[PDB]
Design a protein around this ligand. Sequence first.
Ligand SMILES: *[C@@H]1O[C@H](CO)[C@@H](O[C@@H]2O[C@H](CO)[C@@H](O[C@@H]3O[C@H](CO)[C@@H](O)[C@H](O[C@H]4O[C@H](CO)[C@@H](O)[C@H](O)[C@@H]4O[C@H]4O[C@H](CO)[C@@H](O)[C@H](O)[C@@H]4O[C@H]4O[C@H](CO)[C@@H](O)[C@H](O[C@H]5O[C@H](CO)[C@@H](O)[C@H](O)[C@H]5O)[C@@H]4O)[C@@H]3O)[C@H](O)[C@H]2NC(C)=O)[C@H](O)[C@H]1NC(C)=O
Ligand SMILES: *[C@@H]1O[C@H](CO)[C@@H](O[C@@H]2O[C@H](CO)[C@@H](O[C@@H]3O[C@H](CO)[C@@H](O)[C@H](O)[C@@H]3O)[C@H](O)[C@H]2NC(C)=O)[C@H](O)[C@H]1NC(C)=O
Lengths: 459, 364, 99, 348, 274
Amino acid sequence: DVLELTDDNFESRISLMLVEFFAPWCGHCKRLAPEYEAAATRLKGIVPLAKVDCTANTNTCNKYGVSGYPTLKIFRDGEEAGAYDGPRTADGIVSHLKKQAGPASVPLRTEEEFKKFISDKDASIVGFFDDSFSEAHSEFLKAASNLRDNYRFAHTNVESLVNEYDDNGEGIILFRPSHLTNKFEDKTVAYTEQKMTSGKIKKFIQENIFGICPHMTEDNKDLIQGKDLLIAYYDVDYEKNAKGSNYWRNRVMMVAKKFLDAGHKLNFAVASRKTFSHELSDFGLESTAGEIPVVAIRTAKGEKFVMQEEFSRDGKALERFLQDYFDGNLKRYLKSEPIPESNDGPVKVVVAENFDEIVNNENKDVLIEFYAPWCGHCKNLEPKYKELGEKLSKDPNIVIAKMDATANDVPSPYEVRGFPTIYFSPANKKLNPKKYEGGRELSDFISYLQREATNPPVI
Amino acid sequence: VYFKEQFLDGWTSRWIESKHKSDFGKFVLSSGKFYGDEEKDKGLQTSQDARFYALSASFEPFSNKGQTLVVQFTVKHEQNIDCGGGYVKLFPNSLDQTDMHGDSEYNIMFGPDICGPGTKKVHVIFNYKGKNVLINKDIRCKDDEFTHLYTLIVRPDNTYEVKIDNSQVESGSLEDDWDFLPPKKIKDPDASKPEDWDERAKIDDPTDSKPEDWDKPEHIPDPDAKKPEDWDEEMDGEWEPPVIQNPEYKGEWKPRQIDNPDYKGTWIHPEIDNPEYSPDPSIYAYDNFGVLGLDLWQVKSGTIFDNFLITNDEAYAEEFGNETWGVTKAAEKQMKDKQDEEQRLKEEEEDKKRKEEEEAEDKE
Amino acid sequence: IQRTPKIQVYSRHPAENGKSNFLNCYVSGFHPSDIEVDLLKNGERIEKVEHSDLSFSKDWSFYLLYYTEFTPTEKDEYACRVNHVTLSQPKIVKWDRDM
Amino acid sequence: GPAVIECWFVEDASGKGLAKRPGALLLREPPPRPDLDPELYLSVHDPAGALQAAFRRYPRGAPAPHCEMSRFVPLPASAKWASGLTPAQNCPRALDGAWLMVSISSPVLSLSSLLRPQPEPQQEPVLITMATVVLTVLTHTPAPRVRLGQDALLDLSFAYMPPTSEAASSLAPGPPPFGLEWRRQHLGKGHLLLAATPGLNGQMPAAQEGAVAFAAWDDDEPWGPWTGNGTFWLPRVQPFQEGTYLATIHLPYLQGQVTLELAVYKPPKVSLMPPELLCLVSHFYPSGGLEVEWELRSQKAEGQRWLSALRHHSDGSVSLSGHLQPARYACRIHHPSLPASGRSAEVT
Amino acid sequence: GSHSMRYFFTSVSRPGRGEPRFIAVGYVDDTQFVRFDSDAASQRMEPRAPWIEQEGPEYWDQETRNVKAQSQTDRVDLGTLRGYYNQSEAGSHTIQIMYGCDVGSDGRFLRGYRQDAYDGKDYIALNEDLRSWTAADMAAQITKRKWEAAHEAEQLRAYLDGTCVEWLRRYLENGKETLQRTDPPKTHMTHHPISDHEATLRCWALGFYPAEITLTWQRDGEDQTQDTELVETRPAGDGTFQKWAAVVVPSGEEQRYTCHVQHEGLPKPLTLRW
Ligand SMILES: *[C@@H]1O[C@H](CO)[C@@H](O[C@@H]2O[C@H](CO)[C@@H](O[C@@H]3O[C@H](CO)[C@@H](O)[C@H](O[C@H]4O[C@H](CO)[C@@H](O)[C@H](O)[C@@H]4O[C@H]4O[C@H](CO)[C@@H](O)[C@H](O)[C@@H]4O[C@H]4O[C@H](CO)[C@@H](O)[C@H](O[C@H]5O[C@H](CO)[C@@H](O)[C@H](O)[C@H]5O)[C@@H]4O)[C@@H]3O)[C@H](O)[C@H]2NC(C)=O)[C@H](O)[C@H]1NC(C)=O
Ligand SMILES: *[C@@H]1O[C@H](CO)[C@@H](O[C@@H]2O[C@H](CO)[C@@H](O[C@@H]3O[C@H](CO)[C@@H](O)[C@H](O)[C@@H]3O)[C@H](O)[C@H]2NC(C)=O)[C@H](O)[C@H]1NC(C)=O
């Protein structure tokens, strides 16, 4: 059904418009081909759809900068626009296309339309401007245009609507989703400033659309992630179990609001376990598959924090974890195999769990050796390293170590490019380890620990 | 008797070697290591490996118009050829014997052509309107070292019959197994499949109706939807029983849509007489035959040609083909088996010698 | 990949005097199917030797079970003869009570 | 070595089956041969330096390499463990054009190069379809023979040159991460011995059966063609580890797979015991190929003889006892592992 | 323990008799229940087990057409393969296919595999990971590309996790009387004085089911795996199995020699002494 927009007639027919660049050999384009056809059939009249076989016309992709297949890109009236950042399924394409079809701000003409707009599953910014030529309306229009791909904008001039909202000019009100209503936080927040400014309105929405506990599930994904956050993952399907989702988000909301009144900065969020199941691996949470919500924290710096404790229905565990994090006691969770208590032997078995306890030790010089199991070089170096350890077990100030670098995330400035890499950290130089890239002989190792370590090595 | 050849050194007087190429192979009169008779099985044989050959014999010009033409010859692949040919070619009077190149102007080619396992078929090609036409049928040609008879018969009714070892192996008409006039019946291009002619026929509700029983709600409250005691509807607004997909959900109401109802069969475009059809009864006819040639490339020489016959009577050629090939074949096969037994005895002796030498080396 | 057959001659029950038993000649591991397995009663082929179906195995090899009834007697030495495309000369495996 | 490798372009279209057409490579005035189809006659211009140098030293007078070509389009790695190699949902643009899997299975060294040719054969010069090698996976031991009990060293050296395109994706100049994957396929077993992703970090499937591979780029230069090392160090090769060991180098939407048959041999020990002579054979492997011979010292020994069933030792080595019923009497064992003369034993 | 259900197909090319022979069988555990033999004039899925006998003729015809179409595809595949390998048409060449699934004792899916092998050399197999194919030669590589193009790995994964396992439970439930049954072995142990300085002790695991048994010879409490001899499990003829283990011993020292027999049907491993 779509037209093939080759180079010779590209700019002729590019003059909104959705064009997907594709390459026949790639399976990704063929996977969405029936989905793309269905989207074209479902979006006829609203937005035309087209296919481009880039393998023939190199000029189009060279000009458009299309280095991938597929790289669905929208062309607003023959003008390059932001690449389609969403699922390549037909439903998501249709949803985003209908979102693009409407103006920057939806002009509400009837009050019933106002309720229909504010009844949507996502937050909704509504402007009330009785005067059509008022500068507040124009500034709101530019604000809608700039932040269009992130928020649902609408405007209206109904006398009842304007009077029931601000009725003083720059009447910008944010209605949070109707399935996210709560008690401690007001559902509706009004814009309070002398003049409505596009930047000011954008900042106001950015700081007020989330409130305390938003339901971020594949939507607003970037708008929340990126700061010092706190995500509670749990079964989150409103159309089927809205009551449970409201219950758990209310628990998280009350604990978050208590600590916010206490006066600390920490954003919160609730997520569905299935949708973000890919992200559960990053926190080493596997798949709980239980009504109990798992809670995790990532900070702006990239630190990760996990509760081992069950999320109590009373909320004691939540506030306990919040005050622990604010104090800063729990260690960053890095993927680490359970360390054995039997760390005896010529070579000390170091894990990412106790890397700070062993390697980062202040009163000893440590020589660590990152090794991998399948590594043949590391298997060949293991017996000599063991003999080195048994020989230099008599030195109290120096201990050599090995940490598996595939099942235990390497912490500290320590970084491994090729196994097996060996590092030496002096007692008073825990911040500047030296990478021993010399020889690989036992005698060479003994010579090196004779050269560097202050305490005389033993035999 | 259009042509006769039994090789019973005078054959060099009636056989002539072309000079088109400076590397043409040399033919030798021989009967091979094994045969049915020392003198009766004498014939031309290739004696140079991986070289081209070109040998032609002139004879009284004659035409095949209105009369049956029969060709008959015996080929022996004693050397166990891997790549080569035993085919022969009929050339008109205008053909130059001394200038016969790889592909000279000929009328009919008949005989085996074997070059590897994939190709093991009789190549019979005819000239018509300045074109070499092969047969569409896959005629298999014998590959063992024994002598194998090959015979072609073409009657003036554009019919052909190919025989191997006096036994019928193929028969038919020239205007039906070749590409003389390939348009015979053409499907009508405008005969598109009608919209009412269903191919994948399916009828809804043949012996069923809307059940209205499977039309259950998509989501029903969970049977074990027990509210938690710690839940406060005052703070939670309004607790509700969780709902899940009911086990009784089905695909709406399908009234057993079965196939093959009122099926008229697969539609096809009806065929009509092609206006481009133009077979000719004189397709089998030729102006004149003047030369019998054999230009073939053989990687492993040792192919013996004998018992050449070109005539007009099927019974005549059949009788001489029998009285030559069948008489040869017996003594050929028994003697061959005798020398094969001798060879196997020699190989067993060599194997025993190798084994005893190996044992002696082991003892040291 | 012409794997040789691995004969295993035995009996359904341990041999005892004057008791019927089933000399199951179990040929296994061979490839391809071109095989002939014949049981011998002191050198001569047994006529009534019922065979089982050409059962297949997971490791791309067949296995047949050529079983015939006999009464273990200490005067005859039952044997199994097997010829295949790979083995040069038909293997003759004698039936041993102990093995 | 040979400057013209006669090959066979296997066609992949299902309608035509697996029909073969001629067509020969040309390593390094290109010699023209009109016999070949112009589409499948590739003048291999190798910038990696691995293939042309490998077959430059290939012994002269050797049999023709058993080359086999075909078309293949880059499909992403199917196995889950390789997901880290291709974490995006868009195919890179650098993979434009056709791709041919040239698997030179010569008796001395296997190979599997990925040739990306040019669109049309040369018109003004001879009919040569210029091509470029991207990923060469050469094995120097296509059929190792390790004695039972010791370790085996399955050589595997690969070479990579990034596909040259207008768009340079030099986000991380240097050797890109790859995934080595060794896999035994012995009569319906199919075990994944090890899968490794040097450079990249992830939870790999555990290396099975004690296997370790030296998988690492030899060079770390920012742009230069990179020649990696992927030998397989399997220790204590037991009979159940016999079979073909196909090794795959995984790259972003690239697979180079080469096979090698690891044959295990264990020379037997023979013994004659006292009448009925029992030629008893000690532990040995492989089970097949054994031939008992009998000699009266000499001439072939008279008397009727039979064999015994294979008494499988739990290690895998077998042992049989040939019984003969009739100077000295000797039995000679003929096994491929031992010198083909035969480690015979005699009783006088 | 773990149960298995397998389906085998075997096209054996017989030069001189036209179409190749085609044998298709089905195995639940190691007991066949269907065997379509092309050489036989019946040319149907003749049943051989009680758990498959009680099936309507419509089911039998379903399997009939199924196997017929599979044979029609397989003969063409054999022809094209014989053409590809460059092998003599006079010789007999075999092509084998098999697909099946293995379940654990709990009835859940445990393993699934479909393999093809030409002439007995593993041709192309589906990994136990159920995601990627393994191909030895390059004809198998072309076939692998052909399968991956259609994403039929997601089809077989549907069958192996689905219809295969469902049929396996249905068979193990209808035929629970004979397949789920286990039988302990009626073990013996025998002495044989090979000489005056050595002797052979052979413990007989006789008449058991299924074949997954292990016999080991603890010498003074230590497993002497190196010098133990054993024969592969051999069918007895009446459904059961029997095995045989052996050890060489110094003459008259049969004090510490334990033939541990371990089998699923046994309550606990047994100990033997002479
Ligand atoms: C399996 O593995 C085995 C290995 O064991 C493979 O066997 C190999 O097979 C190849 C062939 O595929 C063999 O190659 C041969 O190599 C020789 C040198 O070593 C070449 O001389 C020989 O050349 C022939 O083939 C090439 C390529 O096709 C041709 O260019 C060349 O001209 C030769 O073909 C001529 O000769 C053939 C045999 O006589 C004819 O069948 C063929 O048609 C062609 O005939 C021409 O030449 C004659 C003589 O001048 C003319 O008269 C003809 O014209 C007349 O006929 C034509 C129609 O045919 C009419 O149009 C025209 O009007 C008439 O005048 C033709 O002009 C081979 O290339 C290799 O040696 C084998 N090795 C071994 C060890 O056996 C096997 O192939 C493998 N299997 C598979 C399936 O691949
Ligand atoms: C790929 O890696 C493997 C393993 O690291 C290399 O194989 C082995 O490499 C070592 C290091 O060079 C070789 O040691 C050398 O041995 C010779 C003779 O013993 C000695 O004279 C040298 O001084 C040096 O010690 C070893 O021979 C070699 N081969 C083995 C162990 O079988 C391999 O070279 C690497 N490169 C490839 C495969 O291209």
